[PDB]
């Protein structure tokens, strides 16, 4: 079957099947000029047994790139431009079309907290203020909401969308936690007014939760409160991320991070998705136990590692980083095939 993704009780329902899912992150899948390169990559993800892919819904600039290069939006105080041309949102159309053809679903965020592919910083350059006042800057929010309608209106009736996502890792450093609560309540109400067929989520890392061991990620210095955010009425499920080598914690601490978040999602009546994770050293040894903890914890509906790597018909390879898991490699055997086999 081919249907809209919904919630069934405490779990997800994907094409009529209720139960736990595995997926992957592929930010770079959105910025390909040859659609055959998107299609070969999605053929590999589908034959591996994965069901969901996370891809970027943004590409923000203050000055247009070299002719031929991709850009989705140009931010300016004298009038901004949304690009629906061949070198614009048509490359994101390639990804939604490929998902329909290979039986996959997509999670899509609308802006980045970080400055990669523009982010909040590109809005700051155009409209003034700073990274924490962005949430309440009138001109910046008016343009963000126009960008949300331009993306949602293309795909609101496609069965390939898993969920819309407000941003990639939203933070408000040192702020009251109410700034993000009020912003997210208003923006998620707006997305639901444009599309009643699909689910909606925040995209946060999961910071700020009092049931943990007190390490920095559990404290309240980045403007977020996990229990308060997951109880917002117009959000349908919780998200959280995990990077111990950047956070100053050890690898085994990740199991407790998964368990506390899963319980907070279930106390709010909803599932959680373990949406982005990686270890810089020995990934097969250190990430495999995390995968088993998520599969066997009540309140967890799925997980997606960072990140997929692949190669094309011309012999070139995709964008890569220290966390890349290359298709058909020894780390694909340990973290993709073996995990899919344990789910079914
Ligand atoms: C950003 O702007 C507001 C002032 O309008 C200020 O309260 C806050 O301290 C500033 N942030 C930084 C990092 O300086
Ligand atoms: C598309 O989905 C909307 C709900 O978001 C629905 O009201 C509308 O009828 C659908 N369009 C078609 C052509 O069926
Ligand atoms: C992947 O490996 C299988 C052998 O296990 C092979 O048949 C297939 O052609 C390979 N695909 C790629 C893209 O390397
Ligand atoms: C490290 O972290 C936890 C506390 O955060 C500690 O209880 C555990 O024994 C340690 N794990 C390893 C293997 O270092």
Strand partners, 241: 276
Which residue, 269, 313, 235, 310, is CA-closest to 53? 310
Resolution in A: 1.6
Q: Which residues contact 79 (CB under 8 A, 6 or more apart)?
A: none
Method of determination is X-ray
- Cα–Cα distance, 344 to 336 (Å, whole number): 13
CATH number, domain with residue 190: 3.20.20.80
Cis preceding linkage at 221, omega within 30: no
Which residue, 71, 38, 69, is CA-closest to 55? 38
Task: Please work out whether the CB of residue 130 comes within 6 Å of at least one atom of ligand 1.
Answer: yes
Query: Residue 173 CA: which ligand 1 atom is closest?
Result: 13
Task: Please work out whether the CB of residue 252 comes within 6 Å of at least one atom of ligand 4.
Answer: yes
Q: What residue numbers bound the domain in which 343 lies?
A: 1-344
Residue 51, sorted as left (phi over 0), alpha (psi -120 to 50) or beta, turns out to be alpha
Which residue, 174, 188, 161, 84, is CA-closest to 133? 174
Whose tokens are 């996370």? That residue is 54
| Residue 169 annotated as lining a ligand binding site | yes
Task: Please work out whether the CB of residue 253 comes within 6 Å of at least one atom of ligand 4.
Answer: yes
Q: What is the largest CA-CA distance in the chain?
A: 55
Counting ligand 1 atoms within 8 A of each CB, the residue from 121, 130, 171, 223 with the most, and so the one to mutate, is: 130
| Residue 205 annotated as lining a ligand binding site | yes
Residue 229, sorted as left (phi over 0), alpha (psi -120 to 50) or beta, turns out to be alpha
Whether 88 and 71 have beta carbons less than 8 Å apart is answered as yes
Breaks in the chain, after residue numbers (C to N greater than 2.5 Å):
none
- Cα–Cα distance, 288 to 107 (Å, whole number): 23
**What's phi and psi for 243, nearest 5 deg?**
-145, 80
- Cα–Cα distance, 272 to 238 (Å, whole number): 4
Counting ligand 2 atoms within 8 A of each CB, the residue from 197, 198, 200 with the most, and so the one to mutate, is: 197
**What's phi and psi for 262, nearest 5 deg?**
-55, -45
Q: Which residues contact 323 (CB under 8 A, 6 or more apart)?
A: 278, 280, 283, 306, 307
Residue by residue, what is the 3-state secondary structure of the chain? CCCCCEEECCEEEECCEECCEEEEECHHHHCCCCHHHHHHHHHHHHHCCCCEEECCCCCEECCCCCCCCCCCEECCCCCCEECCCCCCCHHHHHHHHHHHHCCCEEEEECCECCCCCCHHHHHHHHHCCCCCHHHHCHHHHHHHHHHHHHHHHHHCCCCCEEEEECCECCCCCCCCCHHHHHHHHHHHHHHHHHCCCCEEECCCCCCCCCCCCCCHHHCCCCCCCHHHHHCCCCCCCEEEEECHHHHCCCCCHHHHHHHHHHHHHHHCCCCEEEEEECCCCCHHHHHHHHHHHHHCCCCEEEEEECCEECECCCCCECCCCCCCEECCCHHHHHHHHHHHHHHC
Which residue, 86, 53, 121, 93, is CA-closest to 273? 53
Ligand whose nearest atom lies closest to the CA of 249: 4
Measured in Å, residue 34 CA sits from the centre of ligand 4 at 47
Supply the residue whose CA is at minimum distance from atom 7 of ligand 4.
253
Residue 219 CB neighbour total at 10 angstroms: 13
| Residue 54 annotated as lining a ligand binding site | no
Task: Please work out whether the CB of residue 344 comes within 6 Å of at least one atom of ligand 2.
Answer: no
| Residue 247 annotated as lining a ligand binding site | yes
Beta pairing class for 73-74 and 81-82: antiparallel
Q: Which residues contact 43 (CB under 8 A, 6 or more apart)?
A: 102
The total number of residues written for the chain in this structure: 344
Ligand whose nearest atom lies closest to the CA of 132: 1
Whether 184 and 141 have beta carbons less than 8 Å apart is answered as no
Task: Please work out whether the CB of residue 250 comes within 6 Å of at least one atom of ligand 4.
Answer: yes
Q: How far does Cα 232 stand from its chain's mean position?
A: 18
Q: Which residues contact 292 (CB under 8 A, 6 or more apart)?
A: 342
Mind telling me the catalytic residues?
Answer: 169, 276
Which tokens is 238 given? 């919780």
Supply the residue whose CA is at minimum distance from atom 8 of ligand 1.
132
Task: Please work out whether the CB of residue 132 comes within 6 Å of at least one atom of ligand 1.
Answer: yes
Measured in Å, residue 203 CA sits from the centre of ligand 2 at 26
Which residue, 137, 49, 39, is CA-closest to 95? 39
Query: Residue 195 CA: which ligand 2 atom is closest?
Result: 5
Measured in Å, residue 130 CA sits from the centre of ligand 1 at 7
Residue 253 CB neighbour total at 10 angstroms: 16
Half-sphere exposure of 281 (CA within 13 A, CB side): 5
Whether 294 and 23 have beta carbons less than 8 Å apart is answered as no
Ligand whose nearest atom lies closest to the CA of 172: 1
Question: What's the total number of domains in the chain?
Answer: 1
Which residue, 154, 50, 165, is CA-closest to 104? 50
């Amino acid at each position: 079957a081919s249907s809209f993704v919904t919630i069934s009780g405490t779990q997800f329902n994907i094409d009529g099947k209720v139960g736990y899912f595995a997926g992957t992150n592929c930010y770079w899948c959105s910025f390909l000029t040859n659609h055959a390169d998107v299609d070969s990559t999605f053929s590999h993800i589908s034959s591996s047994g994965l069901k969901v892919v996370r891809v970027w819904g943004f590409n923000d600039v203050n000055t247009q790139p070299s002719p031929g290069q991709i850009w989705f939006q140009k931010l300016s105080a004298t009038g901004s431009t949304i690009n629906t041309g061949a070198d614009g949102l048509q490359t994101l159309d390639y990804v939604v079309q490929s998902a329909e053809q290979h039986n996959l679903k997509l999670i899509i965020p609308f802006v980045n907290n970080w400055s990669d592919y523009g982010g909040i910083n590109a809005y700051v350059n155009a409209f003034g203020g700073n990274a924490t006042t962005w949430y309440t800057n009138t001109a910046a929010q008016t343009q963000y909401r126009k960008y949300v309608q331009a993306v949602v209106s293309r795909y609101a009736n496609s069965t390939a969308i898993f969920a819309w996502e407000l941003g990639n890792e939203p933070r408000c450093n040192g702020c009251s936690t109410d700034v993000i609560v009020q912003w997210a309540t208003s923006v998620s109400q707006y997305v639901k007014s444009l599309d009643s067929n699909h689910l909606v989520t925040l995209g946060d890392e999961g910071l700020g939760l009092s049931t943990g061991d007190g390490a920095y990620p559990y404290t309240y210095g980045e403007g977020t409160d996990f229990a308060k955010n997951v109880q917002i009425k117009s959000l349908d499920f919780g998200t959280f991320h995990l990077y111990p080598d950047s956070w100053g914690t050890n690898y085994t601490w990740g199991n407790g991070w998964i368990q506390t978040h899963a319980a907070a999602c279930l106390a709010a009546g909803k599932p959680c998705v373990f949406e982005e994770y990686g270890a810089q050293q020995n990934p097969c040894t250190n990430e495999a136990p995390w995968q088993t903890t998520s599969l066997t914890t009540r309140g967890m509906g799925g997980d997606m590692f960072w990140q997929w790597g692949d190669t094309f018909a011309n012999g070139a390879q995709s964008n890569s980083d220290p966390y890349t898991v290359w298709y058909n490699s020894s780390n694909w055997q340990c973290l993709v095939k073996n995990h899919v086999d344990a789910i079914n």
